[PDB]
């Protein structure tokens, strides 16, 4: 169908990722175990060496709505752990790619990782820390979930040495030893790890999850450990559309990252909107996205809701608190009015599929979902068509504002409170201008 | 000898198979199955391909060597049987009519040593794991059977699922599931599975109506379903890949000749920012809008299998570079941004077209809303 003329532009795209998991490190570069010893030893991160874990990165950029799964969907060619950064994401790219062909299970990057209970409850940062590749300040920084992951590790092998040892005595045995146990992790089958929408993760978590795989692949000796193979992130996400320091903003901003990684030739942009029908809203998405300057005609379209009267099945995007107060009242006036009405929110449900109870309110328990009154941070890559937005000025950036516009289909079911183009708003165009000096670089592969 | 490719299925498939290895197993169904002779011009690649299959007869061989699969690899081998006794009628029989394969002519034909073969390392990693012939699944029987429902990873699905995700239509089911299961590995293009599925749409070869026209349940008759399809035999089943192959090769032709452009002079520009976003979403609209892209698909769309009818012709695609690649070198990227959404999107009217409808400004409405604040004291600027 002729929306998919894009796809052999995804090729090339492939290309570069087989080519850059498939070149070997040299032995002396390569991680060796007895880096993860004395890790699990040392008290404070105060004594880390300076030590380089290496990895490759092929990023994917662009707006929502660009087609950016696309390339997830084709990378089924390769031998590849897709994993997403929130459990939605997760969900969204299994439903994603298990409606085009097989797909096992997608899990969060914390299932893979090792990410478990005892490391949400854990302050992170507290250590100080004063570039080169050689790293150490993000483990520093994320090392309560580091140190803990480690030591667990550590205290729980041979699964993949045996059949190594076996075909000593006869490199072929050893890639069947998933296919014969059913706990190994997934980042001991493969080198190519995709990250859906990664900026929903913290800059300092890229380093973990290269520092983990390594581990793993090191603790297991599985056979790319063995191949002195490379991790390859694949990092899929809107760098503008979302938000410390992005995993994204981190590899397009940082220079070292940006040079070691040499993006320039690993780098696909996903320029088009297939969502948004009308000209003149993309335009403006356009501009505020790409930087471009504001003008009184991107106003005058601009131009062209607490009160929960009239705008039924119309969520209304608020910062905190105010949600709250919406959704009390929306409850509060509702009993004299359908609904009716009975801890992410306020108190209480009312009853719009929400609207039978007993107490499998209809589910085991009752935390549950609205989707009536929910932040402008929540609202990024949930996307929506009931869109009513409620800015306050005084903290308004346009990066908040080109978030809320952009989560609907048509600017006909678009409403808010004020114009976030004419007062006062932040201009944060660092992003902005890294992405446009991308498009302008001959090396960089642009998909239409 | 014509070797043969033949995707099986079971009505799980895994303990089916272990079982029939064991000599201990259910009829099986030849749903696809490819047919190629080992050991030229896509004119005699065509001829040969077409002589192997026919329209009377299932194959054109004598003896058959069948490679039984299941589902980088998307399809991986299970058991290799030869034909060459009048058990072949058994053959000629499922590869032609859908007549499921019994287990008795599975034994009778199974090489064992070829089988075995491409086992010896699975039973292995078994015994490996167990220590910390391939009858291990009458001892440590679970444990052998989640083994092998790890390896051949979604070999047991619906027939649900055959039907959904490779077509609605039979030229879908039959000739995208043999090229991508099969034919893609065996002969280029990597190419995900809805690519494949598009180019099968421009294979605008002659349709026939089903003798029994029929479709849909579970796993008794989709065989059926795809083996007596016209397009399972002859030169439309002969020339599919070869066309894969060629309407990739135009394809790519055409998107790398305007990739090239379209980077120089994203590379050459020195231009601001406004004018370069707006040049780069006007040259891939003026290279790749949905009407191009149709003509494209047209000119690039067959009728006639035999690469020597080709009644494709050279495209338009990039020819087309006349229109908008004037960059020899208000400004020109905008007026034709203009001259172009004008067409695509529609005439915006002007503003003295609605101050006719209101010949508000001394027309009473001008207090008509402003005035009315309703009590909500367009509105409130400094609402879309
Ligand atoms: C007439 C025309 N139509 C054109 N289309 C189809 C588009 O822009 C499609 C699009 C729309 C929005 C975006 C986007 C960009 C950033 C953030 C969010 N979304 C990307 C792509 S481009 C031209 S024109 N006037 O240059 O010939």
Redesign the pocket.
């Known amino acids: 169908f002729l929306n998919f003329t894009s796809m052999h532009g995804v090729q090339p795209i492939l290309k570069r990722i087989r080519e850059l998991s498939q070149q070997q490190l040299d032995g002396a570069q390569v991680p060796h175990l007895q880096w993860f010893r004395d890790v699990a030893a040392l008290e404070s991160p105060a004594g880390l060496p300076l030590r380089e874990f290496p990895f490759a990165v092929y990023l994917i950029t662009?707006?929502?709505?660009?087609g950016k799964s696309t390339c997830v969907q084709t990378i089924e060619v390769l031998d590849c752990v897709v994993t997403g950064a929130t459990r939605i994401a997760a969900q969204n790219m299994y439903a994603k790619l298990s409606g085009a062909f097989l797909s096992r299970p997608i899990n969060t990057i914390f299932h893979e990782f090792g990410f478990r209970g005892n490391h949400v409850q854990a302050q992170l940062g507290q250590y100080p820390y004063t570039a080169s590749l050689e790293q150490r300040r993000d483990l520093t920084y994320y090392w309560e979930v580091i140190l803990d992951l480690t030591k667990r590790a550590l205290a729980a092998r041979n699964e993949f040495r045996a059949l190594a040892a076996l075909e000593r005595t006869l490199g072929a045995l050893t890639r069947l030893a998933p296919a014969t146990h059913g706990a190994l992790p997934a980042f001991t089958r493969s080198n190519v790890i995709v990250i859906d929408e990664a900026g929903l993760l913290g800059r300092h978590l890229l380093t973990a999850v290269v520092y983990c795989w390594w581990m793993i692949n090191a603790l297991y000796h599985t056979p790319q450990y063995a191949a002195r193979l490379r991790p390859v992130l694949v990092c899929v996400g809107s760098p503008?559309?979302t938000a410390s320091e992005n995993v994204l903003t981190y590899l397009i901003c940082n220079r070292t990252l940006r040079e070691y990684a040499r993006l320039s030739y690993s780098w696909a942009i996903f320029?088009?909107?297939?969502?948004?029908v009308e000209?003149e809203?993309?335009?403006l998405?356009?501009v505020?996205?790409?930087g471009l300057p504001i003008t009184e005609e991107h106003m005058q379209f601009v131009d062209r809701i607490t009160n929960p009267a009239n705008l039924p099945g119309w969520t209304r995007l608020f910062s905190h608190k105010e949600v709250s107060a919406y959704m009390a009242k929306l409850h509060a006036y509702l009993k004299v009015t359908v609904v009716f009405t009975l801890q992410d929110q306020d108190a209480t449900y009312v009853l719009n599929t929400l609207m039978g109870y007993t107490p499998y309110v209809v589910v085991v328990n009752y935390g549950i979902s609205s989707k009536l009154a929910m932040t402008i941070t929540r609202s990024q890559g949930l996307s929506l068509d009931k869109v009513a937005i409620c800015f306050t000025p005084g903290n308004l950036r346009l990066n908040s504002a080109?978030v809320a516009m952009?989560r609907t289909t048509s600017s006909e079911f678009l409403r808010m409170n004020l114009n976030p183009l004419r007062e006062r708003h932040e201009r944060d165009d660092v992003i902005s201008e890294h992405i446009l000096s991308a498009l302008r670089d001959p090396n960089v592969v642009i998909v239409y | 000898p014509v070797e043969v490719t033949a995707l099986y299925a079971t009505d799980c498939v895994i303990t089916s198979s272990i079982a029939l290895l064991t000599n201990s197993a259910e009829p099986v169904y030849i749903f696809s199955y490819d047919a190629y002779t080992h050991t030229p011009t896509e004119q005699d690649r065509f001829e040969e391909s077409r002589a192997l299959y026919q329209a009377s007869g299932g194959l054109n061989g004598d003896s058959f060597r069948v490679t039984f699969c299941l589902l980088r690899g998307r399809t991986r081998p299970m058991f290799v049987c030869r034909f060459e006794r009048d058990d072949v009628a058994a053959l000629q029989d499922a590869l032609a009519h859908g007549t499921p394969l019994q287990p008795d002519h599975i034994a009778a034909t199974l090489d064992a040593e070829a089988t075995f073969a491409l086992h010896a390392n699975m039973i292995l990693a078994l015994t490996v794991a167990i220590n910390n012939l391939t009858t291990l699944y009458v001892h440590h029987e679970v444990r052998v059977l989640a083994a092998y429902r790890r390896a051949y990873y979604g070999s047991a699905q619906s027939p649900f699922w055959f039907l959904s995700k490779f077509g609605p239509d039979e030229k879908s089911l039959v000739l995208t599931t043999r090229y991508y299961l099969l034919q893609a590995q065996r002969l280029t293009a990597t190419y995900d599975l809805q690519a494949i599925k598009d180019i099968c749409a421009t294979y605008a070869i002659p349709h026939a109506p089903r003798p029994d026209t029929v479709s849909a349940t579970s796993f008794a008759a989709i065989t059926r379903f795809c083996c007596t399809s016209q397009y399972a035999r002859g030169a439309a089943a002969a020339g599919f890949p070869l066309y894969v192959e060629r309407r990739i090769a135009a394809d790519v032709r055409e998107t790398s000749a305007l990739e090239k452009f379209i980077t120089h002079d994203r590379s050459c520009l020195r231009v601001s920012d406004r004018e370069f976003i707006?040049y780069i979403?006007?040259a891939?609209?003026?290279c790749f809008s949905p009407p191009r892209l149709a003509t494209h698909l047209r000119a690039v769309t067959t009728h006639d299998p035999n690469p020597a009818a080709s009644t494709e012709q050279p495209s338009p695609l990039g020819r087309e570079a006349v229109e908008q690649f004037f960059c020899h070198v208000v400004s020109f990227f905008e007026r034709?941004?203009?001259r172009?959404?004008l067409?695509?999107?529609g005439r915006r009217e002007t503003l003295t077209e609605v101050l006719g409808r209101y010949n508000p400004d001394a027309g009473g409405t001008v207090e008509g809303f402003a005035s009315e604040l309703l009590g909500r004291i367009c509105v409130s600027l400094c609402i879309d």
């Open positions: 662009g707006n929502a709505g660009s503008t559309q320029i088009n909107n297939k969502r948004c000209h809203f993309g335009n998405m356009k505020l996205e790409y080109y952009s | 707006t979403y006007l891939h609209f003026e034709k941004a203009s172009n959404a067409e695509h999107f």
